[PDB]
């Protein structure tokens, strides 16, 4: 018998993980404040990492990597890149991004606005989306919190029929050994309303968020395209495959991100043990070049894919540490 605790209210993913753990008949859920556990399915904020791996006679494992917030928070991820020599500004899979504090890098941001003005080429940035420099700075000081100003992709890849916009979500599981596992199924969060070309002010066709979109469910069920339908489309419309044109770059971006932070976050020689499920958000443009948007620490999975991925987490992240008395992932070797 193994023992676990649940400490995350909202987590629909780890609600399903706990459900599958109890169902195996070898895992007993204890009360939240019981210290005598094998597994913690911890909270989003203020997780007590310092308390883990200190109970005698127990191997302890947690579903979060400490310090992985440096990849998942907007302002941190931008800093890590323009810092981590492993990446440096000399990046090609990332967009030109800047951090702005409300009453810092403003000397650097205005130098990029000037050189883009010189060639008169597309000078559009993101948080609302505007073209002018000083008409966006009033928005940052109004809201209160620190926000990132990122180069808006003015020419994105368009799905036909519809003349649309989309973003790809990949699910990545990093085990206790720091094996990077990419889930073979991803999802395309689509905009049903055709993408506006000159007008920047429009809302629904520019952003592709599942919550903010709710034209809903016009072409595919719930504005979500699975990997077989998108592979088939690329084969007919663009003569290429998903594996070659998009997926190779995705694998490179995932691998480069987690290899960078490995010395800082790895639980290789620790008293406690960590795994984590990540949500990488991508952007394919007209020339089939893949861009990174952000990483998710507590990611939400696609409704049809829950049963297989959550079984996969149990398979290689949990049962590898706690065996019971096959692979749905692609291992990204390093």
């Amino acid at each position: 018998m193994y023992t676990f605790v649940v400490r995350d209210e909202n987590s629909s993913v780890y609600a399903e993980v706990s459900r599958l753990l109890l169902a195996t008949g070898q895992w007993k859920r204890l009360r939240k404040d019981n210290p005598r556990f094998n597994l913690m399915l911890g909270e989003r904020n203020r997780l007590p990492f310092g308390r883990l791996g200190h109970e005698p006679g127990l191997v302890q494992l947690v579903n979060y990597y400490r310090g992985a917030d440096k990849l998942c928070r907007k302002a941190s991820l931008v800093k890590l890149i323009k810092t981590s020599p492993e990446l440096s500004e000399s990046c090609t899979w990332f967009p030109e991004s800047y951090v702005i504090y409300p009453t810092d890098e403003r000397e650097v941001f205005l130098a990029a606005y000037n050189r883009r003005r010189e060639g008169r080429e597309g000078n559009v940035w993101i948080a609302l989306i505007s073209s002018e420099a000083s008409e966006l700075l009033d928005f940052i000081d109004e809201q209160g919190q620190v926000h990132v100003i990122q180069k808006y992709l003015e020419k994105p890849l368009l799905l036909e029929p519809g003349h649309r916009k989309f973003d790809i979500r990949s699910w990545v599981l990093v085990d206790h050994l720091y094996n990077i596992y990419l889930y073979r199924e991803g999802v395309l969060r689509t905009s049903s309303e055709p993408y506006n070309s000159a007008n920047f002010q429009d809302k629904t066709c520019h952003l592709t968020n599942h919550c903010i979109q709710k034209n809903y469910g016009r072409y595919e069920e719930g504005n979500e395209m699975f990997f077989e339908e998108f592979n088939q489309y690329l084969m007919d419309a663009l003569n290429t495959t998903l594996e070659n044109s998009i997926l190779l770059q995705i694998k490179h971006i995932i691998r480069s991100c987690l290899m960078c932070i490995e010395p800082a976050i790895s639980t290789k020689h620790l008293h406690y043990q960590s795994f984590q499920l990540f949500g990488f958000d991508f952007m394919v443009d007209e020339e089939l070049k893949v861009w990174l948007i952000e990483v998710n620490g507590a990611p939400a999975c696609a409704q049809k894919l829950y049963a297989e991925l959550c079984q996969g987490i149990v398979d290689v992240a949990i049962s590898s540490v706690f065996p019971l008395a096959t692979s749905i992932f692609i291992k990204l070797h390093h």
Binding site: D33, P48, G67, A264, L270
Partner: protein, 437 residues
Amino acid sequence: MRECISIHVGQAGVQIGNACWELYCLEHGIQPDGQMPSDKTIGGGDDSFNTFFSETGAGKHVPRAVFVDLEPTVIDEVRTGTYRQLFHPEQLITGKEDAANNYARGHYTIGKEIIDLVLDRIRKLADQCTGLQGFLVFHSFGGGTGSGFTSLLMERLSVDYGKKSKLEFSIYPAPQVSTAVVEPYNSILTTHTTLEHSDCAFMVDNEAIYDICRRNLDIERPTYTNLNRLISQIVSSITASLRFDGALNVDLTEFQTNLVPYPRIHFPLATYAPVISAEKAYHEQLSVAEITNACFEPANQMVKCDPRHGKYMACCLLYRGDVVPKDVNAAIATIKTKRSIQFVDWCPTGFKVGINYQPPTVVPGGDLAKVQRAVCMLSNTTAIAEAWARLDHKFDLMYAKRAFVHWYVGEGMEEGEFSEAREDMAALEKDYEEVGV
């Protein structure tokens, strides 16, 4: 030359004291009967070893130490032990009945009756000192005596010797080698009373020492002796600069300067390498690069915590054995590029290095093998606050129900002191937060 007086309080203090003074004697070539053939100025002198040992006309070298326990059993083994002639009986003080795992009984009840005798016996050693610089206090966090009597003594020593420096060697409690269920209570109570009276404090988590003995020395179930011989090695490494010719950490004031910028945040993390089994037949001797790299592995620390998720304020590297500056600098250069060593913005990313060419001394027959080189890293990291969070949470669980409180109140202590001690601790946790993140 400025002298240091060692005070050992409770069972843990006394027994760790035993191992330390045993080790100091082997380092300086002092025999059981207090004789030292290598010493040429018979009767006295102001050498670096004279900081810890005073001399008599007979040629005997006597530890500048006082052992105090409220119970006879432990110190009686010192009185009858292999180093019985080394101490004069006035240095060894014992009561009738112990503090029975109760802080309040050790601080208020049984403390009051013995406190004046102890301070008088301390003064008797201070008057043998031509220019005393301060004290090293050895105790447990979880004992009745260790928490209770120490905190009272630390209060009184700030009155009688306000100019002088005080240093703590504290045994943080672990369930693997626990003696009392109220060890979290005793620990929070003592820290609160001691915090303003302590200049620099070295925490030794019994958990970490227990695991090092299991992992690196191959002992299935480590005894108190197994832990104490390992702790004393770390203690010896820290105190070596006071007992030997050198230019780093020459006095106790320099420990504050080098390791303690903020006065409240005064708990530097010790890390030691290498710990090698003597019963191990084949061993390949580790290099300067290898032993320095081990200082940043959590498995080798005196307290289990992650310095990657925290900031440094000071870092000392203390080498014993075949070590040269060239080899050290090359190791630092390689490590900096591989590991997450983050300092606070208001501090230089630096290392103060001390080398002593004489390799570490081991107790014959003991579990520790002879090594060509060893290192002890002392780093004031904000990561040590993990040990505070752990202990505070354990305090919170019991105190929420007022469990065991009556034993403390029944000794004249007030319930308010508990929550005063706890809020001071919560203040300390947030002091580490401000500096750390």
